[PDB]
Design a protein around this ligand. Structure first.
Ligand SMILES: Cc1occc1C(=O)NCc1ccco1
Ligand SMILES: Cc1occc1C(=O)NCc1ccco1
Lengths: 200, 200
């Protein structure tokens, strides 16, 4: 029995489980299945502990998962997270988004700008206007003066916020998720599982 | 895109991941790889949340995993666990052991008796003799009078405790784990992973 060959097989299987769980996480995010997303997120986070070295593709995969985790927590108030990071979940999604090894195309810029505005707007939606100003100061003229005046006037439903809305942010992010979903739809684990289901 | 066929494929894959993680947990337990055991335990616990209905074989698999989790925590003092269960980890392993759908052969009786004695002895090893008496009272002549006198006299290294030792309990449990390990050594995920490793 070779310990090295066993550890190698376990690393291969962890790589397969990561791809499968990413595919499942992407689908739950697209479908709005919150509980399923939470369960798959917990599984992916646990599985990646079985990998101490990741390839460039595997890093892109875990950062996509981390980004979606932050986006899904966009309207959730986590004190233990705010005290550890200093920032809100949408600001943390913005940092991940700006660092993933991916092309900065029109869709990347659109998602980036929608997250920047929604990081402020979700604080206003929750009634914390002092936090909305702190988020504005961490992220961010004539445009900056306008945005800051809007926050100061508690003008949550201003036309600018209606154009750079939460639903628009979610739709644009979902479009990106569809490319990830299609790119991974044929990974080993899901592909083998689908073959079993079709045979039944 | 059929949501039902996707959920079905995800249930198949969860069944495969459960078998793989059980195999890995069994190996880490046998090898004494504590950190690896802790990581695989966290992964298995997360993965089983993706299954709402289990077959008889799948239930046996999760109860083997739960039993090993309790045995591995045998000498660990968890207040949040003692307050939720009322009992120590080895007493919780004993309840799982007595309920798994398996044959009550010589090895089953040997493991059972070794766990009953070690549930008392690990409390004495840790210097908590009041707890050792509480454990004795929850589990449990002329033999009972002898065992209780031994606890009362803080006679931790009494010949009875040396015969029904922690090392003897671990060896007997490891022998059982070797049968589980051999029974699952050919499961889909590990088998496919091994084929990839041999091709490299
Ligand atoms: C790999 C993975 O899949 C799903 C979640 C994770 C994960 O690592 N979560 C931690 C986290 C979220 C943001 C930063 O770190
Ligand atoms: C399925 C599994 O694999 C590894 C751990 C588990 C699990 O469910 N842990 C919870 C637990 C331990 C004792 C009772 O409940």
């Amino acid at each position: 029995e070779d310990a090295g060959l066993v550890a190698e097989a376990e690393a291969v299987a962890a790589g397969w489980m990561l791809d499968f769980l990413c595919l499942s996480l992407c689908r739950a995010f697209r479908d709005g299945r919150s509980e399923d997303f939470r369960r798959t997120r917990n599984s992916a986070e646990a599985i990646i502990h079985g990998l101490s070295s990741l390839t460039a593709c595997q890093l892109r995969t875990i950062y996509i998962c981390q980004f979606l985790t932050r986006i899904a927590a966009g309207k959730t108030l986590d004190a233990q997270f705010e005290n550890d990071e200093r920032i809100t979940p949408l600001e943390s999604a913005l940092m991940i988004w700006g660092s993933i090894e991916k092309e900065h195309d029109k869709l990347h810029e659109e998602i980036q700008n929608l997250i920047k505005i929604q990081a402020i707007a979700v604080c206003m939606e929750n009634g914390n206007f002092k936090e909305a100003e702190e988020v504005f100061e961490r992220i961010f003229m004539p445009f900056k003066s306008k945005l800051l005046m809007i926050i100061s006037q508690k003008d949550t439903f201003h036309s600018f916020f209606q154009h750079f809305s939460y639903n628009h942010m979610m739709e644009k992010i979902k479009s990106y998720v569809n490319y990830v979903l299609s790119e991974k739809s044929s990974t080993f684990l899901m592909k083998a599982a689908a073959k079993v289901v079709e045979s039944k």
